[PDB]
Amino acid sequence: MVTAKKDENFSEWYTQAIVRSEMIEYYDISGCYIMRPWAFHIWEKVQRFFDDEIKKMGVENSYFPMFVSRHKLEKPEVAWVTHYGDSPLPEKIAIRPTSETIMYPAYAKWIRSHRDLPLKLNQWCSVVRWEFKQPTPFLRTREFLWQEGHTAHATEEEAWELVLDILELYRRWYEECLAVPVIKGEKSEGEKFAGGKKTTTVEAFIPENGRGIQAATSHLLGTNFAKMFEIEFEDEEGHKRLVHQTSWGCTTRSLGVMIMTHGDDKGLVIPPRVASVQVVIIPILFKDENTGEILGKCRELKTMLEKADIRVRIDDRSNYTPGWKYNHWEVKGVPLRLELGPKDLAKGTARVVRRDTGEAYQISWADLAPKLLELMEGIQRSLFEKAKARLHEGIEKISTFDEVMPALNRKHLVLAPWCEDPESEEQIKKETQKLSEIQMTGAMKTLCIPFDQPPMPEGTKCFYTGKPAKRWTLWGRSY
Template identity: 35%
Template sequence: MSEQGITVKKSENFSEWYSQVLIKAGLVDLRYNVQGFIVHRPWLMRIIRAIYRMFEEELEKTGHEPVLFPLVIPEENFEKEKEHVEGFRAEVFWITEVGDGSEKLDRKLALRPTSETAFYYMYSYWIQSWRDLPLKLYQSVSVYRYEKNTRPLMRGREFLWIEAHDAFATHEEALQQIREDMENSRKVIWEKLGIPFLFLRRPPWDKFGGAEDTYAADTIMPDGRVLQISSTHDLGQRFAKPFNVTFLDKDGQRKYVWQTCYGPGVWRIAAALISIHGDDKGLVLPVEVAPVQVIIIPIYYKDADKEKVLGKCRRLEELLKGAGYRVQVDAREEYTPGYKFNEWELKGVPIRLEVGVKEVETNTVTVFRRDLLRKEKVPDEKLLEHIKYLEGAILEELKNRAKNFFESRIVNATSRQEVKEALRSGKIVKMPFCGREECANDLKEATDGGKIRGTEIDFKEGDYGKCAWCGAPARQIVYVAKAY
């Protein structure tokens, strides 16, 4: 059992719990021989694909269309926006050679660390008139950044995301898009995956390189550190100018477009899903995202019972498949039912059906809920209806738990002492703030990494008493946290 299962408690040692669950549930393999590049195993790939599908569906509902841009970005594109190149230069992988190495490329090619400078090069061709606006395109791809410290699904040299790049005739429409992106995140990350988050406007010193403003979703991980899981940038006209993306407006004037980009961090959303819903036995997955939604375990101890037990398992499998569920019978003979229970619990399968002789004789099924670790008997004829009910009930349970944890982690503070104490005990602080970068730096140093994460999106500056950290007049209410 100790080999098979997780050997630490999530609440006591999250870091070790996370490392174990990634390996033991068969999500990733870290033994590939290039540092910071991981192998995504089937169980993870199926979860990630489900997350991609959810976002793509929402993006398409709001008028986005899929594209695929080249992986490589020539150096000259990359350097067009000054703050952008400053923000990313240190992290770029460069292709410089081809073939046997004797042939150098005539110019270096960057692996996309993000694709503004690829997309907007083409936007100057595609956008000519107000009729071409808004333009809303996205791609689902891997991106590449030479990160010093990596952690699977949280920070990697290769990671998976979606990037949506939108262009508008006016700044008002661009600002409206930021709300639409927030709503898109809410629908997927909160409504479907049950991961709560704060949507914050980052302070000016923590913006994306090349953005006027950055808005981002922070969730809270079990150890109290926040993880940024999606971000939207108000790019203003900062890229439109160097890339010369202009349109002839209805009034006959040629104008620069207003742009936004939105990046749901699919990798990090998977990390949050694993970490927030998981328990001491392993993963706990919502039904919609689970690679196997219902696992059926036959239980018999005599060969004479095998046929009738397995027969019932197969009938239930057909029934559930017919209703569209991803269902599997675990008929392996080399493992005991107990071993199988542990394995599928570790992998987070939300619903387990146990079928033994008693279930055959009484026309019932024993139904196990992974989220509650609780069993109940259900008559055969009620099974389909019950599974349908569980779909919603399991998601509700996970959402409630996650929300309770999330809310319990946010505390108000009005003094330096309270800020320090809260951050030390793994809390997120909500506090009045003066708005100065020096104060933020001082706070960060004194608290071993506490960062000003920003204000809520609809927040208006005003008089909020004294800054909890420095005592100067406070202009904002901000959230402060240690971050991944």
């Protein structure tokens, strides 16, 4: 069970939560962890939703090799294979950190005419970024699972609308499945993906350590990579034009984020929409009191709730006390826990405890399926809405730079008018980092320029340079 406290020592709390809930297991190679079934259930669920939604868009899944030649890569932190067994490769090959240098030549080969567009591929794989720093399970790891999508189109308007559609699917992944609120915005030109035209992004906020984290990203690559890799088509009139590319990505970091958003001092709290066990049925057995009837009814209740597509498990393992089972499913975060013991056998009801709030209900057996649907909807919405309020309580609207340092001290982000000069963002990072040193990184940086822009009074000056401000920008310490 979890001993540490979320608002007192976040780091050890998080470690305990993930470990005690059986989601991860440590490994002798630093930077890689093991994803036990409990976490992978959740992953499977969001992968299913994203997959169905992108298949609805014509995107098709595929698989490109893990390996890229050195020649075709330096056309850093990439991992190099030099030997098989005991013989060295004639050329070292690297392991993929992202798949552009692998797929894009194939794109060059496959695209000749307008009729071959759009071209929309996704792939669900593992990548390797071997930064020699300190990892954070889910959040920052040397190997991780993601999906990545790459499309090429005949026009930039098409590409751009797909960028937006995909980032909307990413908003739904987080807010709608994992109950984590996020912010849609656009990356600064010092933070955007280089040689993309424009990066869009969903951002999240960890209040317990006042930090920003990127959740997913969708790039408008435009035509830079087409020039690079010579991906041309012939339009209707017979002209050779460059294609307009997008790519987009989202990883298991999402599970990390969800743990921090909903976790509490007893452990995990798993939003029902992604819960593999939404309801655990715990038979209360002691002194051979009514065990045959208790199990009879528990299995009947299971078939009842399964008819309503509630995902139900009866914890009838003989070698565990009920109280151990309670703590087990609590630390694990099963949304709803249903207790049936011999005294309920004559009541015709049963006791239901919701994990998020701990409230208890006495519900009839006939009334179980619909009331449990209802509670799960309410848990899902309320997980989300409490999180969304914490998010917006953590953001401060400022006018001048004087307001920054107090705000970061309250573990908050700042929304400020900005002129969007790239060198000013770096001046800002350095200034704030040094001020932080007068007492994990202390520097503050841009997170995104929110799509949702609040009102911009005329003659608003950039909070740092005093120049005329162009857009509100979200800044904060980061992950």
